[PDB]
Amino acid sequence: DARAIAAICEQLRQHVADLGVLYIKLHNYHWHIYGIEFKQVHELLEEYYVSVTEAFDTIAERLLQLGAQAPASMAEYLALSGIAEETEKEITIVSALARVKRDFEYLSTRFSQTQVLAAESGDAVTDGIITDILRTLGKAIWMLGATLKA
Amino acid sequence: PDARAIAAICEQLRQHVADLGVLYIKLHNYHWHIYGIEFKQVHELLEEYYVSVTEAFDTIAERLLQLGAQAPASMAEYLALSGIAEETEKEITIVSALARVKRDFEYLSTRFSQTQVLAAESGDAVTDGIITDILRTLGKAIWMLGATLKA
Amino acid sequence: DARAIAAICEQLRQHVADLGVLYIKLHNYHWHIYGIEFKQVHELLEEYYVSVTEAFDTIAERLLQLGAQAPASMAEYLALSGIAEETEKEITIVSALARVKRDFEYLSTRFSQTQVLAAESGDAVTDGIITDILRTLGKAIWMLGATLKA
Amino acid sequence: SAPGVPDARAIAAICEQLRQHVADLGVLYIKLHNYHWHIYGIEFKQVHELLEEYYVSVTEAFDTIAERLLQLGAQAPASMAEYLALSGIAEETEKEITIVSALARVKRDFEYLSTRFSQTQVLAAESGDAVTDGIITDILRTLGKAIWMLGATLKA
Amino acid sequence: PDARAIAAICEQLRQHVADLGVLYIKLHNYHWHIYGIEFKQVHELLEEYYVSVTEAFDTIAERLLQLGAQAPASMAEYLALSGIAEETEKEITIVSALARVKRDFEYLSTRFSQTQVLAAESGDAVTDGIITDILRTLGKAIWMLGATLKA
Amino acid sequence: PDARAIAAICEQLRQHVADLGVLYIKLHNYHWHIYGIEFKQVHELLEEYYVSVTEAFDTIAERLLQLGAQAPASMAEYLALSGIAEETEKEITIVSALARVKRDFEYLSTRFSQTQVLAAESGDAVTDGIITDILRTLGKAIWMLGATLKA
Amino acid sequence: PDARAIAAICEQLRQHVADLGVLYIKLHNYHWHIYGIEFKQVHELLEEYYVSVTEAFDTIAERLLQLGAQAPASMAEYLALSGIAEETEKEITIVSALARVKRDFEYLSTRFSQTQVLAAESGDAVTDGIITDILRTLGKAIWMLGATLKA
Amino acid sequence: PDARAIAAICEQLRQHVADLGVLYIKLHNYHWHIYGIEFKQVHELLEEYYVSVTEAFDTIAERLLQLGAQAPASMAEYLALSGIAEETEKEITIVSALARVKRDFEYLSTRFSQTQVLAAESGDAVTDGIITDILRTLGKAIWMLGATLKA
Amino acid sequence: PDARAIAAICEQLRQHVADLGVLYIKLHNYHWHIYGIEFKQVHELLEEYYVSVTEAFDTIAERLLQLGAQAPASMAEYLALSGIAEETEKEITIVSALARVKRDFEYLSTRFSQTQVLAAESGDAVTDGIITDILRTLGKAIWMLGATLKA
Amino acid sequence: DARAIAAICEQLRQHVADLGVLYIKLHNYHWHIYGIEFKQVHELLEEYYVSVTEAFDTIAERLLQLGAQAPASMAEYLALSGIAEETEKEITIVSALARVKRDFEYLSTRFSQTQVLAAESGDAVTDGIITDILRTLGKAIWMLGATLKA
Amino acid sequence: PDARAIAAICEQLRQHVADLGVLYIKLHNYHWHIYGIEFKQVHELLEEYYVSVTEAFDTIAERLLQLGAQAPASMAEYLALSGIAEETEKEITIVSALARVKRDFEYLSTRFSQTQVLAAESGDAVTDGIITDILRTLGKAIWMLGATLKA
Amino acid sequence: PDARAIAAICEQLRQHVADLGVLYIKLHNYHWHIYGIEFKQVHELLEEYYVSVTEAFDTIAERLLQLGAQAPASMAEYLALSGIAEETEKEITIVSALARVKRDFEYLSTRFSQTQVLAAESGDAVTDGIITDILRTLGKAIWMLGATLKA
Ligand SMILES: [Fe+3]
Ligand SMILES: [Fe+3]
Ligand SMILES: [Fe+3]
Ligand SMILES: [Fe+3]
Ligand SMILES: [Fe+3]
Ligand SMILES: [Fe+3]
Ligand SMILES: [Fe+3]
Ligand SMILES: [Fe+3]
Ligand SMILES: [Fe+3]
Ligand SMILES: [Fe+3]
Ligand SMILES: [Fe+3]
Ligand SMILES: [Fe+3]
């Protein structure tokens, strides 16, 4: 189904763009958060962007395997991404975490659409790749929710 | 380091972060789109480079933070500050890709050298050491790229 | 489909309970088996309960991610578990292995039902989590069968 | 009791204590998972991980004590039914709990275990059961450190 | 299909073991007889491949065992079941060897995908996951080989 | 210098590769089909064996290459050169499987010893050392198998 | 400073070294001469034992040195001080060998316990701890051997 | 200044050793007496700090030895040379403890910077590098403490 | 319980922390100022010692905290509580330095033994174990120093 | 050659006995040497007995492989060994090292005879085993000679 | 030729040390001056080679010491004993550099084989084993170089 | 700017490579021929030194390459450029050998310092850092040697 592969590639292209944007956004929080929990969150944010760049690369490479070329420039990412960049510096810890949780959730719904497409079209490999990412997102979203709960 | 010198240094650091950020993604571009018999080796070399680049990206940004400034943290800002052009084409020859990273490494090298001079003259020993360390790894990579591209 | 999520959570709740019960049951065999193969089986049983407590923890956390709370007391486990506790001490090696094989098989059919639910409802993450567990169970069941075969 | 042989009254008394320790440790093991899963608050990640360290440590003591019991010629309690019957530790019935509330409770359970373990170490020491003495004392040492740290983090 | 599905899947698995077995030795052939300036790198790449192939070889065979079947375990059976031709020539060019492994990887890929589909439609989640994992590493290798062979 | 000695040695080496190749798969057969209370231990022992066998398989084949010959690299060739019978049955007792590998190890031992004598008498020190190393591990395994099978 | 207690403790320690020394070689005897289907596992278990025994051998001897005494350091002295009989037979059943080491472990356990009590009552905390640690590993081994020998 | 510059540098180094020594114990004080919900994390952070402090303590003292001087090596001397006040109170809040170490780190930073300037101007490259490396870790810690204390 | 005993034990612990603290720096003194052909080895041995000393320093101070007391945390307090004299001279012979640490280790050993007796008689099992562990490492070091200093 | 094998086994039996005796002799020095170089020699001696016990075990096992049974008791070792036990305690470092060097040299000549036998009879495996040991002995003998040289 | 053989062997060993020493530096020459697309891989291969060469360098020199001789230890002596010509040119092609090391490896191989024969015939088992081990690694490298240079 | 400064620096670097090369072999000389009770320790120390020396050898040579020059790569060139005399005698005292390496280390230190100054004044930050790092390790070794040789 040539229409399925194309639909999936379009989704993948967007994921790369969103991941790329998130990668830098996470550095923003990584650098500008402040508060008593600084060190822990500073490190958590790094774990996140390391994980994000990992998904960034595996998805981009899956795109390559599917015969497409991956978006590879900030210009393209800003044009494809559905994630807003963080413009402010100096941010509270709870505010930064709430924002990454929101972006993680946005990515989660976006990735789920792709997993459904891949599943229905028999693209087992893409299915597995997205599902693995979905699993780590789910764990992070849950933990963030738990730390932000009042 | 006096106030002024610090401001000049921060301005340089801000640009370095932007250039490193742009280079980081540019390297992925080559990482993904090069082709040729040497693919695997260069594919891996490119990764070593962007890992190294993102490392410098992070330490310089944090030095900027220590100096009391805030680091540029968005692609919009990077595109506005960077002196490095993004790679618009996909599917590229290995020698073409390497020649381009060599060129960008050289551009970064001259840029970083200006900062090391500023830091050195103003007594900013820490910034001096940080840039010099990066300068060292750049020099090594530039030399190796030159050797592999030499005809 | 919140309907499916509730069904899945109910299954997960039961899995946690069964795993919890198995965890202690495996210690029972771990401590009370006897026979020339003691050391090897003693160690195998430990590998099993370490593996079981791992599944115990990942399934419970998946339940948490799905918005539910995990059963967290022996009282609840005894009330939800479909696995009978080992009441006797001092047990033969073949008898102990035969029993864990049986419990592993029971868990396997139970987990399979959940994987089917998750698969049909698009819960890719839960699907992957259960399937991973199903894989290790399958391997263990096969090995136990091979060692018990006469 | 004599050099390498605690008297019947001593080994029996020690085994009874050990049986209870296994039961309490077993109950604590699951209780710690409860907090591990249901705490919430800004310190979540750190406490979530601390709780895991605790139950890993608890299950370690759980197993070494059970094995000591086996060595002493007894059989170890090995079912939740028996644990609930022997344990002096109440199970956590509520879900969703405050971090300070959860930590205060584990500190309380750790202290309860500490006093119970101390009785056993005294029994073992007086009866010459050097091995059991060393085993409980090692556990007592890690409990003491954890109790102190919890106290320090909960201090206002 | 139930006992009909497991039987179909086992038949596919039996073939996979056979093909993997044949590929395992075929890869050694290239491993030993390739020649050219890129020798060392390819020599090593080929080893990575047969290590990976023998890994899939064993996990699939064991899955077959779990499904209640016995695994083909002799070269005679493999030669009888395999759809992969053995390499009869020695002394082979690097691009020629890589092109051939890429072709066999692609053949395995289409074969494995059929099994993936069977397992998926019959609810054999475990077999599904096992083949999909293998399919993922094959896809990566096929892509890399394609990139290094691209002119 | 006696080309005759190197030719005789190569002929022996080619046979070793073939026998090792056949044993490699035969060991998997036992690995997969043994049954009995000692299953896990023997299952793992068999794997240690085929890992060891494939190691010897590779070093001997490469020695053959160094001597200027090409290594047999196909199951067809192995079946034609091997003096080791493939295991046709599945589902086998542990003592029966171990007795068979002990027998094959002993067969390999006498075969390898002939080669070590040839290499020793012709001054092929390297081949001598290679075979002797393998002979050492075989001796250890044969002894252990004998001890576990002793009644 | 109770010389009387220290002297009694040293006498015990001297004997422990002798017994451990004799056990060390006795364990090799079983290690080498046991036979049976469980060979490999017991062969390795026995090694774990003598490695552990030689460890106790060395720490106790050094404790003796710390207490101002000299350690018995010859087989002649060990044979003269040891309460453990040497194994004169070779070729032994696995259950027979394990039953014998269990017996020797139990003998050592009661002997060590006496020392533990001496050290405890005289305030020799260090010796107490050293023997108790050994007593703990002996207890675990004795229990395991009992479990494997239980019918 | 040759002999004059070396003497000035040694005088600075002697003070650094004294201050580091005092800080080392001061950090233990906080390490032991802080209290609050963040206890474990800060308890560990403080340890990282004193481990790092004692590291600088030792390298600077050894540099002093290399320069031909003897290092101050007693608490009496440290209390006499140190510009850092000892913590007399026990039981302290986390923010209060961190604020104090930040303050001491900043004091050390300005003090170390003077030495780096001296070393740089007199050509003492080695001392320069040593102090600058320490300055780098101090800068990072000062920044992080500032970030965690920011309201 | 018996608070009287706890107070006595805490008083001992407080002194141990003080002595350990003083020893820690004293060991650095020897570490830096010894000279002689055996320099490197002793230099390193001394470091092992102060690393070990600071470890005991920390565990004992924390035990004190657990017992409800606050630990002495300043050089001023240590100098006031310590029974160990600081080393005032620099440039010292290796045998002279080792003889002095042996002497301090022995002083600590007798001091620690009193505490272990107190803890033992009062049922403070944890403190008993902690001190005994330290007593064990001291005993080994004292014995080794004695052996290297023996003429 | 059933006669060469017998001669080799007789040599191996002696090696085991000598190694066994040396093992304990080295502990003697390990425990009783004294002098400024104590720690270093104390450690060197341990390296030696670890190495000796290694050769002890591999040679004994080779003996087993050759169809013989290994001497396994101090009584037999004292009866077969050509190495005298150290009867004195409290010994000088140079004195102890000189003695181990002498025992190493004695072992070296003894092992060489076996390597010659094995070589001439085609016992490649035994040849390699003894030669490997001969190599480590040669290195140790040379180093001891260098440290004892005046 | 008991002692005549040792002298002949020592003479050979002395030459090997000299040749290895010269090769060591020659390999650095290629390591630094090769150029071409395969640069990084060959650059690293060359390093593996000189690390391996310096390893043989040291074990052979030490064997010489064990045999009662003194090892040549100066470039002057090496240049006087070595049969390997130093590389005088800078900037060299990759195939040209590899062809040269292959040639030097082959030269060393024939040289080493003569020593192996000497040692074997004179019963110098240790030297035999040492040279044979080196001969084995040389054989593999020579074969690989041959394969990468083959056209 | 200043192609004169780079030329002067390269000339210095070329000499450093030559001296390091010569020292590398000289250290092996002592490594092999020293004798005395401290043999093992010094034997090992010397190895640490030549490993460290060959490390500096390699990094400086590479820096030279980066600066656009070619590195001296032959013993003939090294003997022509080196200011370090080769050790002609074998069999040497330990104190005599250490005194000589200390002397050569000091010679290298003053030579390296001149380069450090040149690089510093000409803004060659990278070379500055490279030499300074080496200068640091030399300083520590010189100090330790001085301490072990002090009477
Ligand atoms: Fe990638
Ligand atoms: Fe960062
Ligand atoms: Fe968890
Ligand atoms: Fe256990
Ligand atoms: Fe397997
Ligand atoms: Fe290979
Ligand atoms: Fe020892
Ligand atoms: Fe130091
Ligand atoms: Fe601490
Ligand atoms: Fe063994
Ligand atoms: Fe050496
Ligand atoms: Fe290099």
E15 and E82 Cβ atoms separated by less than 8 Å: yes
Nearest to L87 by CA among K84, J142, K72: K72
Contact present, E38 and E30 (Cβ < 8 Å)? no
Buried-state track B32-70, b at ≥16 Cβ within 10 A, e below 16:
bbbbbbbbbbbbebbeebbebbbebbbbbbbbbbbbebb
Asked if residue K64 lies in contact with residue K71, where contact means CB atoms within 8 angstroms, the answer is yes
CB pairs under 8 A between A and E: 29
With CB atoms and an 8 Å threshold, state whether B41 touches K41. Answer: yes
Instruction: Tell me the C-alpha distance between D85 and H26, whole Å.
Output: 50
Structure-determination technique: X-ray
- Kindly tell me the burial class for residue D22, based on how many C-beta atoms sit within 10 Å of its own C-beta (0-12, 13-18, 19 or more): buried
Residues with CB under 5 A from ligand 6 (ion): F 58
Helix boundaries (H) for D5-154: 8-38, 44-71, 80-86, 99-127, 130-154
Roughly what angle, to the nearest 10 degrees, separates helices H94-122 and B125-149? 70
Distance CA(H35)–CA(H17), nearest Å, equals 29
With beta carbons less than 8 A apart as the criterion, state whether B18 and B81 touch.
yes
Do E and K make contact, counting contact as 3+ CB pairs within 8 angstroms? yes
Nearest CA in chain I to J34: I147
CA G51 to chain centre: 11
Q: Which candidate, D42, D37, D41, places its Cα nearest to that of D52?
A: D37
- What homologous superfamily does CATH list for D1-156? Ferritin, core subunit, four-helix bundle (1.20.1260.10)
Q: If you measure CA to CA, which chain G residue comes closest to J86?
A: G74
DSSP assignment of E105-134, as one string? Answer: HHHHHHHHHHHHHHHHHHT-HHHHHHHHHH
CA distance to A62, B89, E100, E148, K7, per residue, from B36 (Å): 19, 16, 17, 5, 56
Using alpha carbons, list the distances in angstroms from residue K107 to F122, I43, K83, K127.
20, 47, 9, 19
Q: Measure CB to CB from residue G132 to each of D70, D71, D134 and give the nearest one.
A: D134
Q: Cα H48 to the chain's mean position, in Å?
A: 13
Q: Is F18 helix (H, G, I), strand (E, B) or coil?
A: helix
DSSP code of residue B87? P
Q: Does G143 touch chain F (CB under 8 A)?
A: no
- What fold characterizes domain H1-151? Ferritin (1.20.1260)
> What is the rounded radius of gyration, in angstroms, for the C-alpha atoms of chain I?
16
Given a contact cutoff of 8 angstroms between Cβ atoms, the answer to whether B102 and B46 are in contact is: no
Any idea how long chain D is?
A: 156
Instruction: Please count the other Cβ atoms lying within 10 Å of the Cβ belonging to residue B7.
Output: 14
The answer to whether J and D touch (≥3 CB pairs < 8 Å) is no
Q: Cα separation of K48 and K68, whole Å? A: 31
Three-state helix/strand/coil letters over chain K: CHHHHHHHHHHHHHHHHHHHHHHHHHHHHHHHHEECCCHHHHHHHHHHHHHHHHHHHHHHHHHHHHCCCCCCCCHHHHHHHCCCCCCCCCCEEHHHHHHHHHHHHHHHHHHHHHHHHHHHHHCCHHHHHHHHHHHHHHHHHHHHHHHHHCC
| Collapsed DSSP state (helix, strand, coil) of residue G92 | strand
Question: How does L118-146 read in b/e, with b if 16+ C-beta sit within 10 Å?
Answer: bbbebbbbbbbbbbbbbbbbbbbbbbbbb
| Distance from C-alpha of I82 to C-alpha of I53, rounded to nearest angstrom | 14
- Least Cα distance to B83 among B10, B11, B19, B12 occurs for B19
Nearest chain H alpha carbon to L112: H125
Contact A63, B31 (CB under 8 A): no
CB contact under 8 A, F128 and J124: yes
Q: Do residues B148 and K37 make contact, with C-beta atoms less than 8 angstroms apart?
A: yes
F43 Cα: distance to centroid of ligand 5 (angstroms): 8
Which ligand has the shortest distance to the CA of D152? Answer: 9
- Could you tell me if F30 and E80 are in contact, meaning their C-beta atoms sit under 8 angstroms apart? no
Element counts in chain G: helices (H) and strands (E): 5, 2
CB-facing half-sphere around the CA of J127: CA atoms within 13 A = 25
Q: Which two tokens stand for residue K60?
A: 């052979």
Of H95, H144, H150, the CB nearest to A39: H144
Instruction: Write out chain J residues lying below 8 Å of I45, CB-based.
Output: 39
Contact between G113 and D70 using a beta-carbon 8 Å cutoff: no
Structure tokens at G126: 């260090």
Q: What are phi and psi of G126, to 5 degrees?
A: -60, -50
Resolution for this PDB entry, in angstroms: 2.5
H150–chain A Cβ distance below 8 A for any pair: yes
Terminal Cα distance for chain H, rounded:
47
Closest-CA residue to B46 (of B29, B59, B62): B29
Contacts of D132 (CB under 8 A, 6+ apart): D14, D18, D68, D72, D120, D124
Find which of F25, F39, F79 to mutate to test the E interface (most E CBs within 10 Å of its CB): F25
∠ at Cα E72 (E66, E74), nearest 5°?
A: 140
Task: Assign 3-state DSSP to chain F and report helix, strand, coil percentages, each to 5.
Answer: 80, 5, 20
Do the Cβ atoms of J147 and L37 come within 8 Å?
yes
Angle at K72 between CA K70 and CA K77, to 5 degrees: 145
- Rounded to a whole number of angstroms, the CA Rg of chain A reads 16
The kind and range of the H/E element at H93 are: strand H92-93
Collapsed DSSP state (helix, strand, coil) of residue G127:
helix
CA triplet E143, E145, E151: central angle to 5 degrees?
105
Q: For residue D139, what are its two tokens?
A: 């556990």
The gap from C-alpha H77 to its chain's centroid, in whole angstroms, comes to: 16
Instruction: Point out the ligand nearest to the CA of residue F61.
Output: 6
Structure tokens at I70: 């606050």
Both tokens of residue I20? 């350990």
Determine, for residues K35 and B150 on separate chains, whether the beta-carbon distance falls below 8 Å.
Answer: yes
DSSP I93: E
Which of H117, H120, H132 is facing B126, going by the closest CB pair? H132
Task: Inspect the structure and tell me whether chains E and A have 3 or more CB pairs less than 8 Å apart.
Answer: yes
Q: Which ligand is nearest to the CA of B27?
A: 1
Taking an 8 Å cut-off on Cβ atoms, the answer to whether B22 and A60 are in contact is no
Task: Identify the CATH number of the domain defined by range J1-150.
Answer: 1.20.1260.10
Q: From B41, which residue of chain E is nearest by alpha-carbon distance?
A: E41
Closest to I94 measured CA to CA, from I24, I35, I29: I35
F132 touches chain J (CB under 8 A): yes
CA nearest C124: which of A128, A109, D99, F128? A128
Facing J39 at nearest CB: one of I41, I94, I95 = I41
Q: Which of B64, B126, B130 to mutate to test the interface with H (most CBs of H within 10 A)?
A: B126
Q: Is J105 exposed, middle or buried (0-12, 13-18, 19+ CB in 10 A)?
A: middle
Yes or no: say if B114 and B12 are a contact pair by the CB < 8 Å rule: yes
Closest Cα partner for C111 from C59, C73, C71?
C59
Strands (E), chain G: 34-35, 92-93
Distance in Å, CA C119 to ligand 3 centroid: 24
Cβ contact K9:K127 at 8 Å: yes
